[PDB]
Amino acid sequence: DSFGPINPTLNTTYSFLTTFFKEISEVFPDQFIHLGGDEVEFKCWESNPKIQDFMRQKGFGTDFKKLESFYIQKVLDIIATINKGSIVWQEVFDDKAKLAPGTIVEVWKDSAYPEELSRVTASGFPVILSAPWYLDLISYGQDWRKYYKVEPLDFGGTQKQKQLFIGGEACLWGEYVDATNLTPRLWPRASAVGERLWSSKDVRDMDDAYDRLTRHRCRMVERGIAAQPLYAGYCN
Amino acid sequence: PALWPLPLSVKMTPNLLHLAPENFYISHSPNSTAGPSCTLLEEAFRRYHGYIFG
Amino acid sequence: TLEKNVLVVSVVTPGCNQLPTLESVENYTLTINDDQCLLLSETVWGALRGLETFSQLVWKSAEGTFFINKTEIEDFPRFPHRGLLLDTSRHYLPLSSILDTLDVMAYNKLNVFHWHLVDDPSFPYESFTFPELMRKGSYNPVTHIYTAQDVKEVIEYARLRGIRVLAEFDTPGHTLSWGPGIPGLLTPCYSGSEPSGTFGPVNPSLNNTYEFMSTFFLEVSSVFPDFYLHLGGDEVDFTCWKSNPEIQDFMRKKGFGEDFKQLESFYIQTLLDIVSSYGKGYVVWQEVFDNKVKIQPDTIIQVWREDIPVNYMKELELVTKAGFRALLSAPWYLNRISYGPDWKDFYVVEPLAFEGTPEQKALVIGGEACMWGEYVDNTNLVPRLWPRAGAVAERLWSNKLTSDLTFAYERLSHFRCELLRRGVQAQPLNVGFCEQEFEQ
Amino acid sequence: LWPWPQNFQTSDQRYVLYPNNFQFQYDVSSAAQPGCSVLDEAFQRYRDLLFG
Amino acid sequence: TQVQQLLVSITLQSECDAFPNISSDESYTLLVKEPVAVLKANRVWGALRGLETFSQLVYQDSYGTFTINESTIIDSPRFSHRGILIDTSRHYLPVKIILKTLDAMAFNKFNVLHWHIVDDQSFPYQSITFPELSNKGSYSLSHVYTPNDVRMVIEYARLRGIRVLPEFDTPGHTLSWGKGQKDLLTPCYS
Ligand SMILES: *[C@@H]1O[C@H](CO)[C@@H](O[C@@H]2O[C@H](CO)[C@@H](O[C@@H]3O[C@H](CO)[C@@H](O)[C@H](O)[C@@H]3O)[C@H](O)[C@H]2NC(C)=O)[C@H](O)[C@H]1NC(C)=O
């Protein structure tokens, strides 16, 4: 007798999500709050009689994309109501839901992700990219190169669309990450991302990036950050 | 050099300059809208003098 | 009732002053009932095994009450040679790191520390016969070194745990660091008619060279008490040899022709004769065998290659059907990391999964997890090593039958929280926690 | 228990241990008796692991 | 031959005692010259990135003498959101290690810590209004981020020009919320 996602039919839920998100408002002084809305499984909602009534009550049919949209819009208002902006995973933008201008969309999927970059900025929403820099997804070899290589601005769109691309994120999901292998796994692999987002578009020279990174990796170690080595070598 | 990330403009000369630990000072310019009351900066000021030398 | 003592009784005698050898016996029985609490082993080395097993069987209730169970155990290793390779050339490893690595090998009942001391980028070993090797080879002749003192500590440390130390000074390949310090040793490669600044593998055409190795491997065999030495021979490149005209001349005189496989065989034979006359046996990577080198029938082939030239399970068949003893390392490459839990891939292997007779399969004496060091140093070593090499540890000790992944996961995760309680920086196996989280 | 023993017979019948008032002692008939370096240290190291 | 002083000059209204947002000007201009080197930036944030840049220019020479090449740097970020996503749900991250991550972001000019704080596996967040959320959803009672822990992170990230953007993922990834919130989670029938 397992459970499912949160129940969007009750207004216990939304009175709970209010008092809660009002607390978050006063705990975290940042303008934006990430709500998520990713990998939303419709398996359980579908097999629920009480929920199946709500679907006629509003005439959604059996399009659970809509019930999802409804829930996420009920929340977005709770946030806009409390003078906070919002960030949300790309599913929400992709199950057709109304977002108040200024709502951030974070792209995280590989499949035609520059096409997702196009849609999100064509529909006048600001975008964050995380898709290419999945840092939890480890592999043998100097994979810092693959993260250094990404050019976030390679997708369809007028110059006016590129202004809506504001930046990116390197993601270390903890499924296989905790205190024991975080610092090594993060750094210097994320430093690659760090230059990409800060430095000019035409800063791509591999030999120089290597040359500066190896020396930056040691300075990290010297400052007590246990960053892993790019390749055979040494510090001091 | 050693910069990471690489800034937007870096113009270097071969001419060297030397620093003194017990004689180097990070302080506010007299014409700056933040002074010795600035917690944030005062903190960094102390912290970095540590990193640079140490 | 309660228990106040463990009685430890060893039948075999050879003190506790000699170092363990390939033939040592690790059997023990652990019997804990009302009438008794007995750890009984054959050799002193079995007792260490027993003591580990014992530490792990201790436990405490939610109240915190230290308990041990009624337990009857008779145990022994499946394979005699259960090792761990460390590479201290691609990156230097502080002595503390090596000793700590031996503490964990203990808990995992590993019994051979394969020490890949030297290689292309680095020569961290200090030679007193040839001081200039370390002096012009190491990354930094003071900070990144192993002193005669350092090396004697590792050996004694390992011995105190029942770990044999297997030294590897890879030759003729992987020797770029030996180049400075001993001149002429390496082969100078050629463009077409004039040398091209680049140096190849150890030059087998010169007498100087064999005189060097003879002096040097006397030192090596003095310093490392274990009967066996690993002499390498992996990834030897013929490109630089063939390109050189002076060597080409040496090939004609002995009548070697055009294949440098037997030129290689000339070197190794001579090198195995040298090592053999100091009373040492030797392990060797598979290439020597694949390259049809004339090789002593007491040699040990370490199989490391997955596909080329033949499947690693076929390599094992070939090596054994030819009468040589085999180490398996191929599918246990801890340097090659991948997303998610690749420990299952290590655990799942079965070393005796090949076409062979009982006594032919009997030449497989164990194997080694390899932690090569290109991307690994002091900073990420521990978490990368454990508990992924523990999968191998059980594969090499436990019974052919113990293979159910769920039962493996249940224990290895419980073991991993125990590593944590013992100050080991072991990485997670999946989602979850240990109640006493790693914090240092 | 890692690695898994060859023959391990287990029970739920349990006994009490006393961290401090606990010792490892060689039987009289043992070939290895005090002076046995390997186990002289071992005994010390494992009582630190178990009850440090 | 000497650098005697680095003077930090804030051009515009400092924003000295504030929290940085998505539109915080992190641009600076650096001058390494004798006898007095000068760092200038409109806002406080620029000066943070500049003092970081400046730490990466001083070095010791062959003899351990502290040395900097005289140079002129002009620098602004290409992007304004440059973050790291950390997940403290799937495994609990001791507060000390989150701080070290910030320092390492400070060295790496990252300015956002996406703190994916909760998920299916555990609810480490100690809510003031809903105290049962952590009490029943967290891995254990020690595996919790009390208000003051969370306070400390935010004030620790401020002193390095990092914004803490928390994430409370909904409506999926919430199996832990219903450990301490009855009827909040859709029950699976069939
Ligand atoms: C240390 O543990 C090993 C493994 O249990 C002991 O070895 C095994 O002893 C058994 C019992 O005799 C051997 O089985 C015998 O084998 C012969 C043919 O080889 C068979 O015809 C007999 O009927 C009998 O079953 C077994 O071969 C042997 N080896 C292994 C690897 O299982 C060993 O005796 C123990 N050491 C001591 C001194 O207690």
Ligand SMILES: *[C@@H]1O[C@H](CO)[C@@H](O[C@@H]2O[C@H](CO)[C@@H](O[C@@H]3O[C@H](CO)[C@@H](O)[C@H](O)[C@@H]3O)[C@H](O)[C@H]2NC(C)=O)[C@H](O)[C@H]1NC(C)=O
């Ligand atoms: C040695 O004996 C003790 C005491 O009998 C054993 O302790 C106990 O461990 C068992 C098995 O894990 C626990 O029983 C149950 O675990 C299952 C599986 O999740 C769960 O469904 C049950 O509700 C219960 O928790 C038990 O709680 C615990 N203590 C008692 C009082 O039985 C111990 O496992 C034995 N050692 C070994 C290795 O056999």
Ligand SMILES: CC1=N[C@@H]2[C@@H](O)[C@H](O)[C@@H](CO)O[C@@H]2S1
């Ligand atoms: C955004 C994302 N949402 C999911 C996370 O909840 C998982 O933890 C992660 C596994 O690494 O995969 C995707 S990335």
Ligand SMILES: CC1=N[C@@H]2[C@@H](O)[C@H](O)[C@@H](CO)O[C@@H]2S1
């Ligand atoms: C034997 C072997 N010799 C080589 C080593 O020099 C490398 O470091 C290692 C990296 O995987 O690969 C093979 S294994």
